[PDB]
Amino acid sequence: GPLGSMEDFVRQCFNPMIVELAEKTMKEYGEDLKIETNKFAAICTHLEVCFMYSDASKHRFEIIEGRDRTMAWTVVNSICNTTGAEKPKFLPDLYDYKENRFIEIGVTRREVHIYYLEKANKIKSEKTHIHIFSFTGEEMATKADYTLDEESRARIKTRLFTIRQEMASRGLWDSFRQSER
Ligand SMILES: O=Cc1cc(Cc2ccccc2Cl)cc([N+](=O)[O-])c1O
Ligand SMILES: O=Cc1cc(Cc2ccccc2Cl)cc([N+](=O)[O-])c1O
Numbered sequence: 001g002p003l004g005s006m007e008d009f010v011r012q013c014f015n016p017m018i019v020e021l022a023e024k025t026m027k028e029y030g031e032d033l034k035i036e037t038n039k040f041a042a043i044c045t046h047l048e049v050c051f052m053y054s055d056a057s058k059h060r061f062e063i064i065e066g067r068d069r070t071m072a073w074t075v076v077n078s079i080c081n082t083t084g085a086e087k088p089k090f091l092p093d094l095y096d097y098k099e100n101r102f103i104e105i106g107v108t109r110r111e112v113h114i115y116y117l118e119k120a121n122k123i124k125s126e127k128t129h130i131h132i133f134s135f136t137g138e139e140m141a142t143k144a145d146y147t148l149d150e151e152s153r154a155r156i157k158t159r160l161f162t163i164r165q166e167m168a169s170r171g172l173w174d175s176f177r178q179s180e181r
């Protein structure tokens with residue numbers, strides 16, 4: 001069976017903007033995308049999911065994730081002073097102007113409940129809302145509040161399913177599925 005390059009897949013499957021933001025994220029975290037290709041893919045995936053989440057209800061969400069750290073932190077600070085929200089330890093992904101809370105998105109090849117627990121413990125914030133997607137359609141949100149309607153989340157799930165099927169047809173899926181730390 002023919003086995004493809006993950007880097008190739010990423011550059012063909014993801015938006016050049018997304019790929020660039022992922023590239024810069026890997027830059028500023030001291031890791032080589034040419035070696036950690038699965039990670040390149042995961043960061044691209046997370047980015048696309050955050051963007052789709054925001055795009056699901058335009059002008060409701062503030063995007064924190066896409067920006068470079070310094071800009072993202074200025075944006076977070078601004079949101080905090082303007083709204084009165086608790087400043088997070090971590091860069092969250094979104095801000096919900098409707099529900100008045102920061103949102104952390106997660107995308108996992110693992111079991112979503114465990115991943116949710118690890119994410120929650122990793123952020124140490126009782127005010128931040130957590131939403132976890134898997135590639136298999138399963139999801140897990142804070143206090144069973146899934147924020148978006150079934151259709152939007154189905155759009156996201158369909159995208160994830162497609163990414164997985166295209167990974168698998170290139171033989172890339174197994175290494176990716178099992179390389180999650
Ligand atoms: O699993 C959580 C997770 C969080 C992040 C973001 C992150 C990285 C360091 C500290 C907190 C947070 Cl939220 C990044 C990655 N990653 O590149 O695989 C993660 O796997
Ligand atoms: O898996 C990649 C990944 C990337 C990000 C983006 C990111 C956010 C903050 C710091 C580092 C990075 Cl790579 C976030 C999460 N996350 O919150 O679970 C991720 O799982």
Ligand SMILES: [Mn+2]
Pocket residue numbers: 065091092093
């Ligand atoms: Mn983040």
